């Protein structure tokens, strides 16, 4: 019963697959067209950024994505709260949409606090200059779902994030199955780059796009920093 | 499978008493703490209020508030969408709390789109001048649960708002049962008046306090225009 991109188990019916699987019905859903109709500006605090090297993360092809764990110590405080990155991963093309227009690629920085509260950065890619952190990690890519690899280098994930951290903020869900909401996502407005053949190289990998469509915004606000 | 404010049917047990009241427990809830920790300043629409007479309207103890039904044709409109007013109703001590502190009484108007989706004004009320709209309804309210009776006047319930229209913003739930999020709060900076009179009948018709307690921010915030 596996949840898909596509077909009769993609993303309109999602919540009918599984009882787990309710949040993707709800009203605070992700992504969500980033447009001027609902952002408005804010005084918002500066983003607090704590990552260390990760040494020989594991690379997972899950199915879905191509996902880097992170090993633990690393961190970002927001509202006072630490949230330790656990993971990031990819989508393409980009899940937010930024004033209806799609990028090429987006990162996801997912970080937990000590109870499991999720706070989310997104990073937006273009096309550009090859990405040598974004080589690392594609050169040993697994190619099928279900396999993992260990990469014998050191990452630090602070080099796939720009040196301009001005953000947009709001209240949403994880963007897959279960969906769950009460998600903090920040997603950063200057993208990074990466060439044409890297964002090539995974769409082919994931031999579909793996993007779920934007969701109603209904009564929120997105926050621009 | 009946709810109350207290007890084993209470608020953290509404969830168990109905499958339709799983909302309940999910992360976008309401009512919240106004608090300085995540609320922030931004650039929002004036309210737009049309709200004509209401011709002798039902007035209704359900046992769990006094509930005024509204004649067809009153609305805000709010993001271009119009919500048009089905009812008010209030709550003692508030619902809402401003930086953790209650108020003595709370209103809320209760609006709805086309579609059912809802908008809800809160006003609090300070103990002070007895309010002249709150008069003609004290008069006459029904004193025990499951009661109706028709008001034989015209009330305007733009008469029970503040005339500052600055409020705070957020995306949030129902405050009952079913408990159903998706609604967009919007709560009066400027507190009114009820007399000390119109407090103590209403707390001694209620038996019990009638508010929710407030419930977790999680990754939400409020805006302050
Ligand atoms: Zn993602
Ligand atoms: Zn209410």
């Not at 001027?36 to 899950?62: C, Q, R, W």
């Not at 004033?99 to 937006?124: M, T």
Request: proline share 7%; glycine share 6%.
């Amino acid at each position: 019963h596996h949840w898909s991109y596509e077909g009769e188990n993609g993303p309109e019916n999602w919540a009918k697959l599984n009882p787990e699987y309710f949040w993707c019905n709800l009203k605070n859903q992700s992504p969500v067209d980033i447009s001027d109709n609902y952002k408005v500006h804010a005084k918002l605090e500066k983003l607090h950024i704590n990552y260390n090297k990760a040494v020989n993360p594991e690379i997972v092809n899950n199915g879905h994505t191509i996902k880097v764990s992170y090993e633990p110590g690393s961190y970002i405080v927001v509202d006072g709260i630490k949230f330790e990155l656990k993971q990031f991963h990819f989508h393409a093309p980009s899940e937010h949409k930024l004033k209806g227009q799609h990028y090429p690629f987006e990162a996801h920085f997912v970080h937990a606090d000590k109870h499991g509260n999720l706070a989310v950065i997104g990073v937006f890619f273009k096309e550009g200059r090859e990405n040598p952190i974004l080589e690392k990690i594609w050169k040993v890519m697994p190619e099928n779902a279900g396999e993992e690899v260990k990469l014998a280098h050191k990452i630090n994930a602070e080099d796939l994030l720009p040196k301009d951290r001005d953000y947009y903020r709001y209240s949403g869900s994880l963007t897959t199955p279960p969906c769950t909401e009460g998600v903090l996502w920040i997603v950063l407005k200057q993208p990074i780059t990466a060439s044409k053949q890297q964002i090539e190289l995974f769409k082919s990998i994931m031999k579909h796009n793996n993007n779920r469509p934007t969701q109603p915004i209904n009564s929120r606000y997105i926050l621009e920093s």
